[PDB]
């Protein structure tokens, strides 16, 4: 079954640095404007659109580099193996591309963390 390999290929990508480092760099660079408040700012949506383009470029490059066509990708993402071979932690920046609520939580949390670390350093 070729779908099982594609699922694991995708999971390996999402665990790897080709994906994880550009994602980390975007989140660290852009999260400072994400206040931990219920109401969201109009700028959050523009930044989310930038995040989408990044995620799409990253996935598109990977698929073409490895030799996986879009429908194989859809088949694998639709398989129940996708959810069992990939953890929720690894899926989170993926799901953030589609789900703004997941995106905002990710940015808010990193913003809280970076501020905490700044405090600890001068303390």
């Amino acid at each position: 079954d070729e779908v099982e390999w594609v699922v694991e290929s995708i999971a390996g990508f999402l665990r790897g640095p080709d994906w994880s480092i550009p994602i980390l760099d975007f989140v660290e660079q852009k999260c400072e404007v994400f206040d931990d408040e219920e109401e969201s700012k109009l700028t959050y949506t523009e930044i989310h659109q930038e995040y989408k383009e990044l995620v799409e470029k990253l996935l598109e490059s990977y698929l073409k580099e490895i030799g996986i066509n879009e429908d194989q990708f859809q088949e694998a993402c639709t398989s129940p193996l996708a959810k069992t071979r990939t953890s929720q932690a690894i899926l989170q920046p993926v799901l953030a591309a589609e789900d703004f609520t997941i995106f905002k939580a990710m940015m808010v949390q990193k913003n809280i963390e970076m501020q905490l670390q700044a405090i600890r350093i001068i303390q």
């Binding site: 109401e39 969201s40 949506t45 989408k52 859809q74 993402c77 639709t78 996708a82 799901l95 589609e98």
Partner: protein, 180 residues
């Protein structure tokens, strides 16, 4: 490709609702009511709020966008992937009926919102001055709406009256856009 990614979701059960209308119409108050949350410190919305509500088998993700004129050019950033439109009117504010009718008309002509079901909440019916839903619907020529289902529902976001009646209609039409 980005739309394929939603299949990675637990139960892709999820409904995206866009909540629009003029400033002061009652959108944020309605949202907090839907979420069973305290309404005591609501202020004019400068950006947008999102609240997720579990109701009758669906996770309804309700997007509450600020209605001030300066924010309306941003409304269109929220049109894509809308399953349901809820449009809120301050029934007591008759001086603004023309302005709100023009916003609704533009929304109903918008390509990115084509075939989307629309619920019109005639809000603030707790006020004695509130115009009846019947009068509002007549004023907005709602009967002329084509190429989508629609509903108008009298409510008060402040008391909660009529809100669940509107949301029951919403839950029956979660797929009206796709089947169309």
């Amino acid at each position: 490709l980005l739309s394929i990614l939603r299949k990675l979701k637990s139960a892709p059960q999820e409904v995206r609702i866009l909540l629009l209308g003029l400033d002061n119409a009652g959108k944020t108050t309605l949202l907090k009511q839907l979420a069973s949350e305290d309404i005591s410190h609501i202020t004019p919305t400068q950006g947008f709020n999102i609240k997720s509500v579990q109701s009758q088998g669906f996770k309804l993700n309700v997007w509450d966008i600020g209605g001030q004129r300066k924010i309306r050019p941003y409304w269109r950033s929220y049109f894509e992937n809308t399953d349901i439109l809820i449009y809120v009117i301050d029934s007591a504010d008759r001086k603004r009926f023309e302005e709100t009718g023009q916003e609704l008309t533009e929304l109903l002509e918008e390509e990115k919102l084509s075939c989307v079901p629309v619920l019109i909440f005639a809000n603030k019916q707790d006020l004695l001055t509130a115009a009846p839903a019947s009068e509002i619907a007549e004023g907005l020529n709602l009967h002329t709406i084509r190429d989508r289902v629609w509903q108008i529902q009298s409510c008060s976001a402040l008391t909660g009256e009529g809100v669940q009646d509107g949301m029951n209609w919403v839950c029956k039409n979660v797929n009206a856009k796709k089947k169309l």
